[PDB]
Amino acid sequence: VEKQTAMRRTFAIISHPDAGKTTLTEKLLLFGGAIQLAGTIKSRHATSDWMELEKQRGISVTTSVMQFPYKDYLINLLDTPGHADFTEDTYRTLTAVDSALMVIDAAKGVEPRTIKLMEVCRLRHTPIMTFINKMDRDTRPSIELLDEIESILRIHCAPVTWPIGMGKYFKGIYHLIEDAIYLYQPSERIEGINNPELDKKLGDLASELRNEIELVKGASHPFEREGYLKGELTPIFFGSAINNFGVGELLDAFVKEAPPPQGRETNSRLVKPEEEKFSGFVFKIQANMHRDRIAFLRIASGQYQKGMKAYHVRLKKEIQINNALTFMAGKRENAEEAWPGDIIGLHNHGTIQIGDTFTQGERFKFTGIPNFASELFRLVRLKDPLKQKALLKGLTQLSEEGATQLFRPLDSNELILGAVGLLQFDVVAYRLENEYNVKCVYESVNVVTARWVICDDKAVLERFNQEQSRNLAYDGGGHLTYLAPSRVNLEITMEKWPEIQFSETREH
Amino acid sequence: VEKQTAMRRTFAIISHPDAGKTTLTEKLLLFGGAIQLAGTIKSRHATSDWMELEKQRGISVTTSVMQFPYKDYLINLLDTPGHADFTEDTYRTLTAVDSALMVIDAAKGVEPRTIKLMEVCRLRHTPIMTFINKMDRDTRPSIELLDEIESILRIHCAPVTWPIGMGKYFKGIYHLIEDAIYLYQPGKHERVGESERIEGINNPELDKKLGDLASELRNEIELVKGASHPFEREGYLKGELTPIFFGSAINNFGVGELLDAFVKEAPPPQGRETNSRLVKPEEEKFSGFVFKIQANMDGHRDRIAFLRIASGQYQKGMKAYHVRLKKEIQINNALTFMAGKRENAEEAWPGDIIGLHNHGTIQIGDTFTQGERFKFTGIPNFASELFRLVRLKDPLKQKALLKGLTQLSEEGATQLFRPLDSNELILGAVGLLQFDVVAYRLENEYNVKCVYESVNVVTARWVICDDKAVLERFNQEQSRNLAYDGGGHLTYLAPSRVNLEITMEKWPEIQFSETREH
Amino acid sequence: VEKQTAMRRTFAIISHPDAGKTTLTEKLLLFGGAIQLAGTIKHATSDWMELEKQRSVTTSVMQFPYKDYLINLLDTPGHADFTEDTYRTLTAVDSALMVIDAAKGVEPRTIKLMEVCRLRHTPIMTFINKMDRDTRPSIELLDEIESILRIHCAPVTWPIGMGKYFKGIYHLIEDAIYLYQPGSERIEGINNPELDKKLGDLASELRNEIELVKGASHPFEREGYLKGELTPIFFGSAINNFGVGELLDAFVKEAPPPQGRETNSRLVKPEEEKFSGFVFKIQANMDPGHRDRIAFLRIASGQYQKGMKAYHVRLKKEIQINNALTFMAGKRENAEEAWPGDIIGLHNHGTIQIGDTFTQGERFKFTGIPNFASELFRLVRLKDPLKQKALLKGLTQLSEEGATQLFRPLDSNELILGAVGLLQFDVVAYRLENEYNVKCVYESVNVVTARWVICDDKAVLERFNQEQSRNLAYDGGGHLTYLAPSRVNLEITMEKWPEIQFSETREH
Amino acid sequence: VEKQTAMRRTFAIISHPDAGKTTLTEKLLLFGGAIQLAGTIKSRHATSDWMELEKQVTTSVMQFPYKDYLINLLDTPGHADFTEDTYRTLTAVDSALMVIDAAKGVEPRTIKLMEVCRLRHTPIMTFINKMDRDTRPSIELLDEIESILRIHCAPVTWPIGMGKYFKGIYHLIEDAIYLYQPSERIEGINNPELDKKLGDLASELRNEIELVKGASHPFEREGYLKGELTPIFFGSAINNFGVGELLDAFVKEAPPPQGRETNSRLVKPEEEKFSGFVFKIQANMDPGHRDRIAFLRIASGQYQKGMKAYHVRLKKEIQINNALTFMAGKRENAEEAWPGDIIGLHNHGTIQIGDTFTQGERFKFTGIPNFASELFRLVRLKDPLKQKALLKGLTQLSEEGATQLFRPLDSNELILGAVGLLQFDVVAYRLENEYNVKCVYESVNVVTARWVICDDKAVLERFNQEQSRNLAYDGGGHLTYLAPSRVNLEITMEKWPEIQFSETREH
Ligand SMILES: [Ca+2]
Ligand SMILES: [Ca+2]
Ligand SMILES: [Ca+2]
Ligand SMILES: [Ca+2]
């Protein structure tokens, strides 16, 4: 039962849209023998478009988690949708990984989502490996790309591979550890950075490689396990994903260095995966676009066995998991068992919520499962006023399943919806109609961001509430929330109240 | 003369690549009856690909500036290449405009180049009109787009038009000043006059045509009225406020509204400061300044120096005074830029750009008058964003390399740095293409083959300090990271962002600038 | 019982005299801790006889431990005590270690001993000795081995410089450099910059030569080594104990454990529970009046146990083995047991002959135990024909004990002795006198070489005999033998009679 | 990979000649669909005749589909081509089907093949054949099977009448009657419809079924799989009657490919890595040729046409490019194979009986047996100069299971031991064709053989001294008693009760 966890590697790719996530995912799948999934994923929208396919077909349930073997390792790749189906779940999914793979477009460097996803990873000091993609086209200087990562993303860079040329004159990569050159020939290998054959085939590029490698080892850091595991250092790899080049070097360093499933804290103790008793937590729910839903559970300890009895901690109730969805690529049936690090899909009809902890009787709740500051806001109401209670009931449940956040402004009876991605508004409106027979209408509001408000000094907090009530609300969890009409307003308010904490995350 | 000036509008579009500048340019050209030209720019790349194309056709300089009539106005649009042909010239072109038109991809909002080009504009408080493009596709929420502009770009937003719907349900725009709705109806925006217009935001006809979009509009406009500013000419002319327009350039929608407000509100040619007096465009005597130089790639060794007319009148074949060379020259056949022209014009006016032919006697920042000696100020260098050591395979060609690099620097082709503690030569560029142009020029004009090497430099700042005791002290601790540029200005070459910060905090009495007067 | 076989390594050193066998042997004993033995190890046959009379058998076999292995090194005397026993000893090994003088290359005995090993396709490991002095070019040495010895060379270590500028060796499999610093500094990586700092130009020449070797040579592959088609090459200086360790570690790792042997019927495997073995060498006591002899037996299967009953197949009766000579270094007395691969010395007085098979009852005879073409020939007669009977009785016995070969021409009445080594004549002369009170005299004969004649076609053979009987003889075992007056005569006869097989060896 | 093993049923038919094996095989092939193959075996000598034809293989194994099942039927030649290979084959099956001639009951071959099956406690199912002719009483047949074949009988079908008045069979489990009409089904043994059609036979059925209740056993799975109990079926193979019921119970109850012990550990079929073992070798008789086929049972992993295999005994990597497959109706050899299947390994004398194959892991499967020789002949040459060749030939022949070889302690003579008379012909021919030696046979005073085992070296040495005239070592170096008579073996075994005289030994 020790080797089942030992061989496992659970992770996700963080990247700004168009960096190369999908392209890389395909290649890694090819290395895993998953020729099936590989083609399927590349065979891939407005939010509306996603909903159309979603209803009729909606086979986005079988690829939210991609499990595949490589060497003597089992790799769990969790999906982080970034386009039409970007939602808060994209952030929350990172809570269920043990490390992350960051993809950067060499021509772009660090982008807005790169920063956001890193901030999320930063919540658990999640180890990061970096693939600098698209070397086959012109790029920013490699040193510049690295420097920016260190300054903006606040993490030391440690090159493991390095580009030879760029764009039209991209001739391959140099593995700093192997001291070998892999030639890019749309894979001849050459040992020794000083090997005279390099100068013969690559010319001036050969001495440029030597030049750059020297600059690197003077202004940069060498790879280091400890720093990497503490999230203070990231090994960098350069390649061209579309040409499946540099990927193999990345994957080998990944399985070798990336962490196996780690333990997680609870409201009582540290749970380690090697414990014989089963346990896990729910971090994502998606409903059938029917009334059944699938709650994605990361196993935290013990083992899962089909048809087993488990303890639903919140509901103080024993349950039986009869046919939990598993994610082995190419499988025909659900696996009979699963292990720590793995994800399983729990079928239900509304009895499972975000953060739900499952055990075998022991009553604890896993911590660290976050809500994230909403980025998009809308007022929600009905045309038929006689349906208010069902609207609230629906929104509450939806809030509990992480589909949306819900805000009740102090000075009114209005309801405000908070979303991280545009699709959530579509999913809410549909689910409300289908599951609650409630027809809702959206309106624009003057809110652009949100912060949770925290002050242990109740006299200060009370003066704050009195003054800022127009911009205050309670969310679905009862937490005081500041809904800023503008970034500038947020700045002024925060500056006006240095005694009050304004947070971008909170525990669900 | 004063009438010639009054009808002119000289501007450039500022935007991040892919935002829609080329598309908007096409549509503006069509409004100006420049059908042929619109077609050409529309039929538009690694830096190497650009180099090839340039060598083959070499007519990227005749469209560097696009002049076209609209109503009783004459419009001068200076291009700001943002793709393969991005270079320092892209920043410096902004010194030659009287206002700017910012284009934003509504699905993207404010991007890195948007920010950078706004910084350049800020140097002169250049007035900004804003166009939010791509409404025909899903966008970020309108109110959010505006907040990011005010927050990131430090300028008040003043909606003049406003979107009705978005993406698949984008149905038109409301004009806040006209109180009128222009319906978006593909197939009716090819020729002017065929589109449907509705009077009044509370007009019942709206609810008929657009349904729930009508009440959403009414709601959003009230939010905007309460949290936004109304358009105000003074704030606009001061560069503190930007009127916002929304549309879909590819479908020629919302463009007419933008163009009409532009010609109405955008400033005509303005006075330009000098080392002494202020020069006003209405003055009788001709004068101007050179703000960029483009070399003929095709055994040619002629170049075009782009000059903005600051006052008076250019006449083909006129005598003029080259202030730097303290010499009289003749201007026999300067390039002009009227769309669809058969030949260069006989005259040009303030706000206009003309192209002066020369073989290296004209440099960036050069002032030309009719006798008066003064130099226009405010023509900037901008901090280089790319760095490379340059050297030779043959030591015997050092003199030619230096001569070439010195001329190229003086023509703005590149920046040139000489570290204090070495004899090495470092080239500084804003755009990747500059290194290609420099290498080609060195070979073709100076018969010198240069070799580039990466160097440990990511950014640079010009160093200024009143107290010379502190400064000279500073030149001791940091000489290894110091250099003199081609103008003899002390420059700090930061190996990293962190190093710059750390050096700057240690020396707060020392100013570190990202721009300097050329 | 199986473990005991797996840990054993039985081998012999094959080499031309003065190549460095004694020196390398000394160093190998040192690695095994046989300090004393290494010391003892370190003219004419007349002198060797004297030392043998005055005072060998205890060191004919050298057994010593090394790590978790037990090594049996069988001696192959090449100086004054060289005899046919030197050849026949190789039939009792499972592999061989060839030592070559880097200054000499392939020499006459190198060729003969390889020919003997080739009989059983004996696996060969090669040590190129004397790197501390000038040598023949390394590429030359290997080509001579491949061309002359008909075996592929697979470099495993490679020399750095030579003679005065000998700096050490490169291990191709470890990619590590061992510095020869005569007072064991190891440098990792052939492209490691520390190499150029310490070895200067020799580093680049090394990398050049390794490239040449890669291209025109073979990498080690054990199937080929074990088949006798490929020999791993090691370089060093035995006198300086340099490069010996690498060889030894590869030896115990790659060299085969005791293997099964064929018999006149079934194949016999070492792991079988029953004891069995064969006699490959015999040595008599040179003491006047004594009849003591030691029959060297290799154990083919089962376990030797002191005082055991064994079956003497030729004599078809049961005997007892009370105090068999054993060969552990530094031993005090003969071991109480021994296992497959080991040699033991059977005490007797003439009842044990070359080829004798011993079992625990089963009736079979091991095959492949060879006679080798004699290289020296002499007529043997008496001054006084009085004891002619005793002479013939002695020569017969000596021939059966491998001390000499005996030929009796088809057409005449002379007795002709054949020897591989000069010493044999001295031992025969001395043994006849001391054991058969016969004084023999030798006479030169016009014979330079011998070949056993084989032909299944009686008519052809009779035709052959009618023309060549003058050159034909029966040997001691009744085998037809051609005695050539000259090399040319043999070539002419062989070319005239291609239907007839002329062999340089036969089954004893 | 899991269902691959679970869908396979590998067995063999055990019976005395003339019982009905050939006929039942045909019927089984029919249910499967292999009409052609079935029609072939129907076209069915002395050893002399067989040797003739065999000069001028693919039906040694008969693989065929039935529902969700794949059936591997290993043949067990009982007539002219009966040899030791016939016994050794059974080591390659996971269960067996016993066919008995109703008029005869348990016959000599029946007993021998059951003894072989017993070596592995091989599950047995039984088919009492030829109900259409007069028979021994059914209770008598069951009784004989019990005491003689030491296995409890568990009827699943039962005959109604016999000879002239065979009217059908009764299915004790289903409680249904299938009528024999040269296939009407009736339910309830006490169904009044039986009496109407069959008459007094209806009461006789009820009577006998009740008799079976108290004196016989009910089919018990665990017991059957343990080899302690065999389900009994009745019918007439010539009329394809009662056959269907046997097949269905077979595919349902018969065990899937089981694991096999080795010198190192128990190897399971489910294992990823490919492994197998040779239990039979067939030589091409055609003159000049030197090719053989080594039949290999797959114990684990999977066979892939063109895979790399590890020849354990030779410590050598080999390549299996075109291994013979035995799917009925096949156009070419199969690209893959799974545990329980048999494939043919082409070679020229480098593969031997007992040979294990893996993918690098060096171990050797166990339980592959040698069986006591039943026929004996002295072998010699008229040309004494070929003694070496004879021995080399005979040794090789011995390792390929073509014969056993014995060397008596008190002479230099060579005795061959065979199970089937054909082996002598095959050996004489092979010695000639492959070793160019002409052997001569002479009768010997030996009728049977037992392997001598005894851990008491004190007793063993005296035994050897006293009985040396009847002792020899075989081709594996095992001490063997060669009895001049049955009575001699009985006495000898009584005078030495501390010595084990076995009829089998691991090869
Ligand atoms: Ca609930
Ligand atoms: Ca100049
Ligand atoms: Ca004798
Ligand atoms: Ca063999």
UniProtKB/Swiss-Prot annotation, chain A:
It is found in: Cytoplasm. GTP binds at residues 15-22, 79-83, 133-136. Keywords: Cytoplasm, GTP-binding, Nucleotide-binding, Protein biosynthesis. Its main location: cytoplasm. GO terms for cellular component: cytosol. GO terms for molecular function: GTP binding; GTPase activity; guanosine tetraphosphate binding; translation release factor activity, codon nonspecific; translation release factor activity, codon specific. One of its GO terms (biological process) is regulation of translational termination. It comes from the Bacteria. The keyword Hydrolase does not apply. CDD domains: RF3, RF3_II, RF3_III. Residues 6-262 form the tr-type G domain. The keyword GTP-binding applies. Belongs to the TRAFAC class translation factor GTPase superfamily. Classic translation factor GTPase family. PrfC subfamily. NCBIfam families: prfC (TIGR00503), PRK00741.1 (NF001964), small_GTP (TIGR00231). Increases the formation of ribosomal termination complexes and stimulates activities of RF-1 and RF-2. It binds guanine nucleotides and has strong preference for UGA stop codons. It may interact directly with the ribosome. The stimulation of RF-1 and RF-2 is significantly reduced by GTP and GDP, but not by GMP. This is Peptide chain release factor 3. It comes from Coxiella burnetii (strain RSA 493 / Nine Mile phase I). The lineage of its organism: Bacteria, Pseudomonadati, Pseudomonadota, Gammaproteobacteria, Legionellales. The gene is prfC.
